[PDB]
Amino acid sequence: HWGYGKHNGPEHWHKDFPIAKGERQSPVDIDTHTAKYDPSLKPLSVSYDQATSLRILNNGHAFNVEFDDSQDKAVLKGGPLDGTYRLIQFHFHWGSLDGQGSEHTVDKKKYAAELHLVHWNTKYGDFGKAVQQPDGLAVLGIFLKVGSAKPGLQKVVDVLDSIKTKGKSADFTNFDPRGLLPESLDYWTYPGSLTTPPLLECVTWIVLKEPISVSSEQVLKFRKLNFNGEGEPEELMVDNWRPAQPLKNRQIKASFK
Numbered sequence: 001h002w003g004y005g006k007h008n009g010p011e012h013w014h015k016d017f018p019i020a021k022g023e024r025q026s027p028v029d030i031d032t033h034t035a036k037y038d039p040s041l042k043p044l045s046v047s048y049d050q051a052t053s054l055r056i057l058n059n060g061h062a063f064n065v066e067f068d069d070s071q072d073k074a075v076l077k078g079g080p081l082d083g084t085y086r087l088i089q090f091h092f093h094w095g096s097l098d099g100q101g102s103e104h105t106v107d108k109k110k111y112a113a114e115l116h117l118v119h120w121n122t123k124y125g126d127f128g129k130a131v132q133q134p135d136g137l138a139v140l141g142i143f144l145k146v147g148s149a150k151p152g153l154q155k156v157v158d159v160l161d162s163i164k165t166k167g168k169s170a171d172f173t174n175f176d177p178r179g180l181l182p183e184s185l186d187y188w189t190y191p192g193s194l195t196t197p198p199l200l201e202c203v204t205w206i207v208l209k210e211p212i213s214v215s216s217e218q219v220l221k222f223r224k225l226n227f228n229g230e231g232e233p234e235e236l237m238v239d240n241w242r243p244a245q246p247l248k249n250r251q252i253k254a255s256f257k
């Protein structure tokens with residue numbers, strides 16, 4: 001099955017998932033000079049006060065923090081979005097070293113990691129139907145740099161020892177994703193895809209300009225996770241990022257002048 005290694009990684013995905021070579025693949029490099037301020041973007045609304053986290057899962061590619069999306073609690077709206085998008089999960093991509101790990105790049109700069117908060121468009125009823133639509137998903141992407149610790153991340157860090165290997169999960173209730181946001185909501189936006197197989201072209205990407213800082217100790221604990229299952233030879237879960245893909249017939253819009 002697909003992964004991030006030499007024999008199953010991003011350069012192989014197109015064989016099982018030919019959309020990998022499609023017209024609106026993600027991630028992309030964000031050329032800050034070419035991105036254009038868009039006055040038609042409405043204010044972005046990140047409304048996470050009633051979020052209900054449930055569980056954290058090592059899926060063999062990353063770890064997902066899952067939310068109760070059975071009703072409108074944690075939602076994203078405004079900006080480029082038409083209607084209401086409900087938070088279903090978040091996860092990260094990260095590197096083996098601090099100089100790589102992000103999926104999006106900014107003027108070709110790679111960050112140490114990238115957080116993805118995944119939301120589905122409520123007009124389609126469920127996530128599965130949403131991923132059959134060109135506007136089914138909105139992913140809020142947040143870069144991580146290594147510096148001061150992010151206090152709101154520590155609860156995630158401290159549970160990772162209990163989900164070291166593929167297929168392990170743990171209760172993860174009462175986690176507040178507001179503690180993972182930077183101060184500014186300035187963002188870039190463009191139409192793209194899932195960055196993992198099945199690579200479906202359903203996503204409105206909203207990538208925040210301001211990174212969050214996490215400590216070296218925090219990201220080092222991400223790097224102790226395993227891609228493999230329990231009892232199998234250890235393959236550290238590192239470098240679980242897809243590189244930038246061709247922009248093709250797309251423009252990146254900026255929320256800020």
Ligand SMILES: CCc1c(F)c(F)c(S(N)(=O)=O)c(F)c1F
Binds near residue numbers: 116139196
């Ligand atoms: C199918 C579940 C799923 C992912 F596994 C995933 F990695 C992403 S991503 N990296 O594009 O944010 C999604 F948006 C997503 F919906």
Ligand SMILES: OC[C@H]1O[C@@H](O)[C@H](O)[C@@H](O)[C@@H]1O
Binds near residue numbers: 036251
């Ligand atoms: O034709 C002019 C238009 O070209 C488009 O490619 C740009 O996105 C618009 O901002 C611009 O007004």
Ligand SMILES: [Zn+2]
Binds near residue numbers: 091092093116195
């Ligand atoms: Zn992701």
